[PDB]
């Protein structure tokens, strides 16, 4: 059998097996610094509740910290299909501070965007399981939820935050909890009487190091290459009818940027990045006489049908010169994550990368907005002429039009992820470029 192939060697094979460098069937493993992982609970300052601001200071139990998991215990105020990642919506603002300097700040909407772009098939399902009710649970069900953080030191051990090296400066996590969480204490805008307040706890996973490496971490200077999220809110320009509006949005970014991601949403309904329609999963009661297109199917606010999107085309312009020729929204929703990430992004969330592998940490290409005087994102909208209530029209139309319900999406959220350097020495840390 196999020897009949083994002897089948010709001149063309010299490129593959001549004077080998690698033997596949004798692998060598690296010996590593001994460490142990421990999950330790932190103490929260401030009253826990909807709309409240709380904070916690990370105790030095270990040498390095990596994963941070925030948990909430919630009671659902409605029946099945009335919530959408309620733990993610609740975790409205989280920011990382080291010694008084803000390092990064994430929003509930960024977490859904991240999920829309970079978490893969079973990982994002698991993420949903940790953040929503996915088993058709009924009103009154209680569930414990986990929302992991994605700061620069949260996903990979290589950037673990060295509290051991920060002997003189505190590291804190500030939280603001949403005042309205769909299906938990509000249904749309209507309060749910008797809704319970959340129980909140923050866990940090500590790394304990062996003797020789802890000494080095504590004494020597370190250069950490870290990522930051830049954000400010914008307004949409979604047309009324008969026209495709243009909108030139001025960008407020600095630093070497890996990518720009953005979405359009209804600020009242978390996760509603597209227009609503009287088709399955696209609005409350869709498909029967009770269907209404001004209220989403809250358990299923995300879709993959870009037909309900608001964005027709976009381009990124730098100092008045187009960085690339105009592309349609379907490019930014489906082709960019295919080329740069390898997963599926639902309709209404758009990505353009400057990097070959923005999903990873090893730098692979950046746009440095500290050297670009005027960078803009130019949008073209779809014409909002489709009657959302008529499946014949919703599922049967062209590229340049969208639903009349598209005009409900009023918030334009443009995100940028950049590189920076966290310098740690003398027991204190801070940014190289502030």
């Amino acid at each position: 059998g196999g020897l009949s192939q083994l002897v089948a060697y010709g001149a063309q094979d010299v490129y593959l097996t001549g004077n080998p460098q690698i033997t596949f069937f004798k692998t060598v493993y690296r010996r590593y610094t001994n460490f142990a992982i421990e999950s330790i609970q932190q103490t929260i300052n401030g009253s826990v509740g909807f709309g409240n601001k709380v904070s916690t200071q990370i105790s030095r139990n270990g040498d390095l910290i990596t994963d941070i998991v925030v948990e909430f215990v919630l009671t659902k105020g409605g029946n099945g299909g009335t919530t959408y990642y309620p733990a993610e919506e609740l975790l409205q603002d989280v920011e990382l501070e080291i010694g008084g300097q803000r390092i990064d700040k994430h929003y509930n909407d960024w977490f859904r965007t991240y999920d829309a772009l970079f978490r893969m098939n079973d990982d994002r399902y698991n993420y949903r399981r940790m953040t929503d009710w996915v088993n058709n649970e009924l009103v009154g069900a209680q569930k414990r939820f986990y929302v992991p953080l994605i700061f620069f030191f949260n996903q990979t051990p290589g950037l673990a935050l060295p509290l051991i090296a920060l002997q003189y400066h505190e590291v804190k996590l500030y939280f603001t909890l949403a005042s309205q969480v769909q299906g938990v204490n509000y249904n749309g805008s209507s309060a749910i009487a008797g809704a319970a307040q959340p129980t909140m706890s923050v866990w940090v996973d500590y790394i304990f190091l062996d003797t020789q490496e802890r000494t080095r971490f504590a004494q020597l200077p370190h250069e950490y290459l870290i990522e930051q999220l830049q954000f400010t809110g914008s307004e949409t320009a979604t047309p009324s009818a008969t026209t495709q509006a243009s909108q030139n949005i001025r960008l407020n970014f600095n630093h070497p940027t890996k990518y720009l991601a953005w979405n359009f949403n209804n600020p009242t309904n978390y996760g509603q990045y597209t227009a609503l329609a009287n088709i399955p999963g696209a609005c409350s009661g869709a498909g029967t006489a009770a269907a209404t297109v001004t209220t989403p199917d809250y358990g299923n606010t995300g879709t993959y049908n870009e037909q309900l999107a608001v964005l027709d085309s976009a381009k990124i312009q730098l100092n008045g010169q187009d960085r690339f020729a105009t592309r349609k929204g379907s490019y930014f929703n489906k082709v960019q994550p295919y080329q740069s990430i390898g997963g599926v992004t639902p309709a209404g969330v758009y990505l353009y990368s400057f990097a070959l592998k923005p999903a990873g940490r090893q730098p692979s290409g950046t746009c440095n907005f500290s050297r670009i005087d005027n960078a803009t994102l130019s949008l073209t909208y779809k014409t909002c002429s489709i009657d959302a209530t008529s499946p014949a029209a919703v599922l049967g139309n062209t590229e340049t039009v969208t639903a009349n319900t598209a005009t409900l999406l009023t918030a334009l959220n443009i995100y940028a992820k950049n590189y920076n350097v966290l310098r740690i020495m003398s027991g204190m840390g801070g940014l190289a470029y502030a």
Binding site: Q167, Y168, R214, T215, Q219, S426
Partner: peptide, 22 residues
């Protein structure tokens, strides 16, 4: 000992456990 080294570009640290006190 697990305290920060002497040579650095960041000068304002206050070494503890070696103070005259009041």
């Amino acid at each position: 000992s697990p305290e920060a080294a002497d040579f650095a570009q960041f000068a304002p640290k206050n070494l503890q456990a070696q103070n005259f006190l009041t």
